[PDB]
Design a protein around this ligand. Structure first.
Ligand code: F3S
Ligand code: F3S
Ligand code: F3S
Lengths: 322, 59
């Protein structure tokens, strides 16, 4: 299975995260799983005209392209020319057009590629967009009706960056005959990773249940949930970040950092407008503006009051102790 | 004897039936009294929870 991994408006974080892959690690994925990595800007040996030969052979159908991985945004500025992202003699968006049209499967890795991500933040100088989404709005660069040659839409492996497993396990599934096991949600994300929430497996959910808030960073995060004071988007964000830990160690929320909802197409949420960074926007100083997914402010708040009154003592003390 | 009379009431089919039904749901009564004991032994905590809740509405 040939893989061509291109980077548009990328920071290469998805590649670096991918390189952190374990079980399989990246080398075993590239070699031992029958995935022929044709080229990758961070890893491909070919430069210049040899690399362009590889790209053109993929684009024109001279050689098969099974998986086109795209990382980074599709940069369309200036004026829709895409010349703020010139790659191998073309605007990167033209490469995207050709290769997405050539690939059996197109995988957008990372929010930039999936939805536009950080570069698509206003004022979006690069005219960045995702492959098939611009933020939540379906269509992105390739249009809502784009399908790869295997009939799939762009497989969106979101995250900023995506966790290595979010792509590697998909690649293994494709390589092991389990492509049919891959189900995609409405954002084209693999449901095997994105039916759960970041909160799922969060070490602070018991504090969340009892509405015990982390009050401060550092040692303050030895207790409490980050939802109330730090804008944790865990309960509104689909991800397996607390199921499949980052770097096989931790997750933002475990570590005391609020989930920024990076697997969600709106990321960065509120465009990091003043007062929204590591803060919970609240109505009347008590009611979070955004409640967990599938809840309503009145039942949430009622249950929150009930949970506060019935809170056990341990939920009000440090638990992640030295 | 008065105690003999309570034993006599215990013989009564209807009294016995009710006492047997009480002993059937005795686990519920036990758990509710245990729940009350728990609530009482954590009454200080629940009072501190109501204090922190009112103290938030104060701020
Ligand atoms: S990791 Fe980098 S490539 Fe985009 S998805 Fe995040 S800015
Ligand atoms: S339970 Fe965890 S995911 Fe965030 S909302 Fe609380 S720190
Ligand atoms: S910011 Fe992203 S990496 Fe996971 S903890 Fe939140 S979905």
């Amino acid at each position: 299975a040939s893989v061509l991994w291109f980077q548009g408006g990328a920071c290469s974080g998805n590649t670096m995260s991918f390189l952190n892959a374990d079980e399989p690690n990246v080398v075993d994925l590239i070699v031992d799983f029958g995935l022929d990595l044709l080229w990758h800007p961070s890893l491909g040996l070919e430069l210049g005209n040899n690399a362009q030969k590889v790209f053109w052979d993929c684009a024109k159908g001279e050689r098969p392209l099974d998986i086109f991985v795209f990382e980074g945004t599709v940069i369309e500025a200036p004026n829709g020319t895409g010349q703020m992202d010139m790659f191998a003699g073309r605007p990167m968006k033209d490469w995207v057009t050709d290769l997405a049209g050539a690939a059996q499967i197109v995988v957008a890795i990372g929010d930039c590629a999936c939805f536009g991500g950080i570069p698509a933040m206003e004022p979006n100088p690069s005219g960045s967009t995702g492959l098939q989404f611009h933020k939540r709005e379906k269509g992105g660069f390739l249009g809502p009706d784009f399908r790869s040659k295997m009939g799939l839409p762009v497989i969106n492996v979101p995250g900023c960056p995506a966790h290595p497993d979010w792509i590697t396990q998909i690649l293994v599934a494709l390589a092991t005959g389990r492509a049919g096991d891959i189900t995609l949600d409405d954002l084209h994300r693999p449901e095997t990773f994105f039916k759960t929430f970041t909160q799922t497996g969060c070490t602070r959910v018991q504090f969340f249940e009892y509405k015990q808030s982390t009050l401060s960073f550092g040692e303050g995060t030895r207790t409490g949930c980050l939802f109330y004071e730090f804008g944790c988007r865990g309960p509104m964000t689909h991800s397996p970040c607390n199921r499949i830990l980052w770097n096989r160690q931790s997750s933002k929320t475990r570590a005391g950092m609020p989930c920024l909802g990076c697997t969600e197409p709106e990321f960065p949420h509120f465009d990091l407008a003043p007062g929204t960074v590591f803060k919970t926007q609240k109505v009347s100083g008590m009611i979070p503006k955004e409640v967990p997914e599938g809840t309503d402010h009145l039942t949430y708040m009622g249950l929150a009051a009930a949970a506060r009154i019935a809170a056990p003592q341990w939920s009000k003390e440090d638990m992640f102790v030295v | 004897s008065p105690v003999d009379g309570i034993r006599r009431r215990l013989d009564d089919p209807q009294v016995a039936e009710a006492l047997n039904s009480l002993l059937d749901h005795a686990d519920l009564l036990a758990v509710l009294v245990k729940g009350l004991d728990g609530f009482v032994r954590r009454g200080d905590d629940i009072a501190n929870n109501l204090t922190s809740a009112i103290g938030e509405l104060k701020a």
